[PDB]
Amino acid sequence: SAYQLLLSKETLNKILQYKQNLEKGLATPGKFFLEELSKQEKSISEMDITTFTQLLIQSKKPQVFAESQVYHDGTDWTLEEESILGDVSVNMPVTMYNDGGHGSSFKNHPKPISGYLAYVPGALLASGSGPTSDMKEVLDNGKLNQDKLNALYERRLLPQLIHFNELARQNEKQAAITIPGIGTGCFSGAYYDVIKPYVRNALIHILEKHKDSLPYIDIIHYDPYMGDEPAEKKIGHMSFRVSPSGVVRGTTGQLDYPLGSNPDTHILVSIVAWDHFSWPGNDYWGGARQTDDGVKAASTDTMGQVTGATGVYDKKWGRYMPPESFTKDRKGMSDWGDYVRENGIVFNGPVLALDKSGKLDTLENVASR
Amino acid sequence: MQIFVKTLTGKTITLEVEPSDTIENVKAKIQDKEGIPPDQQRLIFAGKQLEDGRTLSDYNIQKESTLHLVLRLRG
Ligand SMILES: *NC[C@H](*)CC(=O)OC
């Protein structure tokens, strides 16, 4: 119950495609998915769609260099699996111990604040080998296609926006959502110098299109660090702020209430730029408080939500550390990825899908319709 | 003289040092050949972390010793 996986209707169709073809012998699993399947007892056709989806998600590894050390060839994952995994997001309640500043710029919260993270994989436009699934999807002979990029981010973000609209309503609050430059860093690959306006346009497109379904979403605080102009934009009832921290001095951090929100009026949600192949937190499973993914995981109790262990926050380095009973006498082999290995923890949790009517429901129910 | 620096992943670097060189200077020589900021460097010789202010003779590091560069690899 510590975290919840979500995916779009289109993604569910992809999963149904894949399961059907495996059942017929007409598709072949990748090596890592096959390992997860072979650790349990059900045949593909015996297991339901949720179990199948969970076992594919379970083939993720704690730390993956998604932009350079993945091969897309079935020796790790196939492109069909990659297309599905990229659409899966995961949310979880978190305690936020600092404002999420990178490097040494983080500011510790005097009292840690309560909120949520939603890990969403960015468009992967980088590869150390063949083209990625996202490259095949959104590039037209090399040209970035804004409409296709829009559809990809809509697919991946909307289930989380629907989720937290509902959660805000249930708590009699509104939602304040902070967003980073998702997909603009190493993920952009050769597109690093052009990607920034495309991502902001996609976020605006999603919010404009689905404004009528998000009445409890109030503030969206978008911070791509550099490369965009300061702005407020009214999108229906919503306030969409473009506040690049490298351009606007004093910008509120990603793990902090943006201007006009506070704990009594708003739930605080931060989108995390995730990736197809890793557990939420990627780099910090290897002890590196780097990238939006690693920084936000290190600056929250993400690792405690995923592993069930009670960590301890280190104010000097802004890091949620493994239990002291684990790290004592383990110097050099004490980071969170080592804790997962020695304990055989797996990434596997409840999964819901967004149906055609904008409701989140079980994969079986949405497939029936 | 020769010393060898070697990462956990097996990358080998050869340095020109003296026993008078300080570990700070040695981390600067590694940045010179590889661009690794001294901040990100842990140098290990015989199970001991090497303090920045001490010297290569303090740790009895002689010619053709192998130091271990513990890095936390970047994406
Ligand atoms: N962590 C991946 C970043 C790639 C890079 O440094 O491009 C030069």
TrEMBL record, chain A:
Residue ranges of domain Macrodomain effector MavL in the record: 3-326
GO cellular component: extracellular region; host cell cytoplasm
GO molecular function: ADP-D-ribose binding
Protein name according to UniProt: Macrodomain effector MavL domain-containing protein
Lineage: Bacteria, Pseudomonadati, Pseudomonadota, Gammaproteobacteria, Legionellales
